Structure 1
């Protein structure tokens, strides 16, 4: 009714594959054993600053249980090696203590209705969603950094939990861009949702995440 109703994309099944694309970028400490770099707080970081230390990895077909909560680490101010969930199809350990990730692709609802998303961050998550907010239909790679004002901005410690509601249509693939940073130590990337008429949250995206071919012409 008076809920946000973002725009989505159409494609035939033959131009559709399963899962999101991931890029991983370096985020160094200032020094290693204010050890951590405050750069991630800069207003320009999400749009272009985040690539300035180079990339180190990528994957495709990211699907299913994409959230994590690593609060087992014992030492701060120190790179700590650990593995991403198996959802990411990325075998190597990463500097889990300090890194930047961009996840992008399309969310397709299994039914038409109001979806509520919830994010919980350590350190930083940005949520863009819709063809007029995240990126253009079938032009993801070129338009990935042309995102608009955030649908959710979650930052540790003071704004770490956020939520948003979007009314979505079964037939539509919605551009989604999820940005994550860890500056130091513990790492939480929790992105879940409540489908229509559903009380319990889920962190399993299986059957909701897709990629469309970048053929350009609004598909």
Structure 2
């Protein structure tokens, strides 16, 4: 905390590497819906929700090779307490409309820095973003699918309205693929999933992950082979 974080990453040969992150989409129902108390579900506030509670309403979709402009800011919605259909950014490779007003998303895979140095990430959430990062915080090297819910204490915890903005700095090495797990929830209305970073020596933030997101084969033995 007085020094900067220096997380652990993974090694892999080039032949086991493909582009983009994996996405799972989960239902997050309203308590009740109006027209043709509070309406929204507080379950996302449960401490157990990020580790297993988030699957309890079932899934509805998934995609792979998620890459590029993965952030969004949907503040155009007009009606609350009501499902609103919209499409994810094309980065997600998911054509169907989702209940953008109310859904849960888990994004996982690997971050590779374009140069060795200190990276600062910034998240802005409506409603809820969790950020895990590193082979000892997000998931095990080459064992993502089996270990995806064994993440550690959060690297950033962003919740609307109060802690909605968070930041963190990690010194990362160019040659290494760092496990990354991004958890997102919208409970209702407006939806903001904004994840950006300032690369080393860079003043302007970027929200474009193109060339930074990769997937490794889940071949196990800490990627030996």
TM-score bracket relative to the smaller structure: over 0.9
Shift in Å, 1:2: 2.0
User: Which aligned runs of 4 or more in structure 1 are off by greater than 4 angstroms?
Assistant: none
Cα deviation per residue 1:58-82 (whole Å; 9 max; x = unaligned)? 0000000000000000000000000
Report the Cα distance in structure 1 between the residues aligned to 2:109 and 2:222, rounded to whole angstroms: 14
Report the Cα distance in structure 2 between the residues aligned to 1:79 and 1:103, rounded to whole angstroms: 22
Report the Cα distance in structure 1 between the residues aligned to 2:187 and 2:49, rounded to whole angstroms: 13
Shift in Å, 1:94: 0.1
Report the Cα distance in structure 2 between the residues aligned to 1:11 and 1:132, rounded to whole angstroms: 17
Report the Cα distance in structure 1 between the residues aligned to 2:139 and 2:204, rounded to whole angstroms: 30
Shift in Å, 1:122: 0.0
Match of 1:47 in 2: 51
Cα deviation per residue 1:164-208 (whole Å; 9 max; x = unaligned)? 000000100000000000000000000000000000000000000
Report the Cα distance in structure 2 between the residues aligned to 1:79 and 1:125, rounded to whole angstroms: 20
- The normalised TM-score by structure 2 is 0.97
Report the Cα distance in structure 1 between the residues aligned to 2:104 and 2:41, rounded to whole angstroms: 12
Cα deviation per residue 1:1-53 (whole Å; 9 max; x = unaligned)? 92100000001111000000000000000000110000000000000000000
Give 1:58's match in structure 2, choosing from 36, 59, 62: 62
Give 1:123's match in structure 2, choosing from 111, 124, 127: 127
Secondary structure of the structure 1 residue equivalent to 2:145: helix
- The normalised TM-score by structure 1 is 0.99
Secondary structure of the structure 1 residue equivalent to 2:153: coil
Cα deviation per residue 1:71-121 (whole Å; 9 max; x = unaligned)? 000000000000000000000000000000000000000110000000000
Cα deviation per residue 1:128-150 (whole Å; 9 max; x = unaligned)? 00000000000000000000000
Match of 1:187 in 2: 191
Secondary structure of the structure 2 residue equivalent to 1:50: helix
The number of residues matched between the two structures is 219
Structure 1 unaligned spans of 5+: none
Q: How does 1:5-44 map to 2 (within 5 A)?
A: 5-33=6-34, 34-44=38-48
